[PDB]
């Protein structure tokens, strides 16, 4: 029945995200969405009574990697937006991986697993952009990037965190399926138009 399957079927909402990320030469960000898409699909597949018998890894692993993979997707989608140079790129990519790994391990169901990375990624972005505004004496990301990427990207970001942390109280079938859709849009929108380090 559909009300058990929809949290698994809606986990294909990240398939637009990986197909767009690869098309834009963002091949690292493409890995993290594809990895997340697989582990989120399996995390819900093993949860759903209609199909839980299929799956081949224990629940302990899938729960950790669906949560870690999600929080790391939110991180690399934001460090793609920051668009740092070297060796700050590899450095700030690695800061996300190590911090989100340890934090997701310590308590994975604590909302802090998402809030820490988003808070730190927003601070790292705000430090770069306020330096770059002071350098140019003007609004640094063009008013197009604010009105087309950041604005809509964080608008779906606010919707995604509200659907997961608040409206889960009302439902887990449709609300959690709409959360997958909302979060896939944040990853598509917060990516730049091209990877400037590859094309």
């Amino acid at each position: 029945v559909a009300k058990l399957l929809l949290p698994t079927l809606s986990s294909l909402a990240f398939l637009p995200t990986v197909s767009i990320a690869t098309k834009r030469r963002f091949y690292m960000e493409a890995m993290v969405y594809l990895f997340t898409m697989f582990f989120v699909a399996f995390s819900h597949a093993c949860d759903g009574p209609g199909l839980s018998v299929l799956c081949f890894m224990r629940r302990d692993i899938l729960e950790y990697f669906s949560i870690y993979g999600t929080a790391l997707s939110m991180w690399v989608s934001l460090m793609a937006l920051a668009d740092f140079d070297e060796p700050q790129r590899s450095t700030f990519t690695m800061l996300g991986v190590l911090t989100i790994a340890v934090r997701t391990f310590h308590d994975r169901w604590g909302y802090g697993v998402a809030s820490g990375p988003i808070g730190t990624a927003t601070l790292i972005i705000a430090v770069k952009w306020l330096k770059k505004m002071k350098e140019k004496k003007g609004l640094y990301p063009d008013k197009s990037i604010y009105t087309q990427q950041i604005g809509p990207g964080l608008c779906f970001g606010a919707l995604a965190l509200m659907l997961r942390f608040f409206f889960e109280e009302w439902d887990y079938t449709y609300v959690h399926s709409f959360y997958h859709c909302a979060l896939a849009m944040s990853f598509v929108l917060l990516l730049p138009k091209v990877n400037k380090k590859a094309g």
Partner: antibody
Amino acid sequence: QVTLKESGPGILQPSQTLSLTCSFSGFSLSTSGMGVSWIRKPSGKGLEWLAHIFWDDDKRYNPSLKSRLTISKDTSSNQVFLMITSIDTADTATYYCARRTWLLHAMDYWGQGTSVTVSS
Amino acid sequence: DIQMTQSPSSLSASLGGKVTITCKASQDINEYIAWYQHKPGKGPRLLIHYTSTLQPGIPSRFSGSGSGRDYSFSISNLEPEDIATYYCLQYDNLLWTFGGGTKLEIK
């Protein structure tokens, strides 16, 4: 409306310092993030940037000419002044002032421009 | 500074035709190009900024594109009112430089 107006001597002798005035209207350079740029076009050449002055009273000059460029403002009389030293035949030009914003950094309104030439 | 180059120094084009005034920067300038129309004996107008964004009040015939040291300004169905000199402005630095400028003319 937004409007600008250049003014200057028009004609003068070589090896002399001149003051060019730009009066601004519809806005004030007192506004946070607001700036004015001075650009010149030598007779039979492409456009060439000269100088900047800003809300914070920071300044900037074209580094090849920086040795004889000096810019200043009076927001009380809604004006910017660009002074060129040691004027020569290369300064036979039309001089423009252009208002730059905080949101679009490329200058969005120009004045009509004024002619400058050196002769005896 | 950064030297800027426009490919046609002058461009003869038919009334109601199309043009593609093409521009190369000396180095990467992060899409901070703006395109100006210098109508003869008058103050220039800003048409396009950040490579592609049109200024409000501009007909949709003018359109810019390109990224990374090569940008393209284009007029569609060009009117007799479009016969003017067209300059790009590099504005990634506060050390601005203009292109040599294209004297577009009627064929």
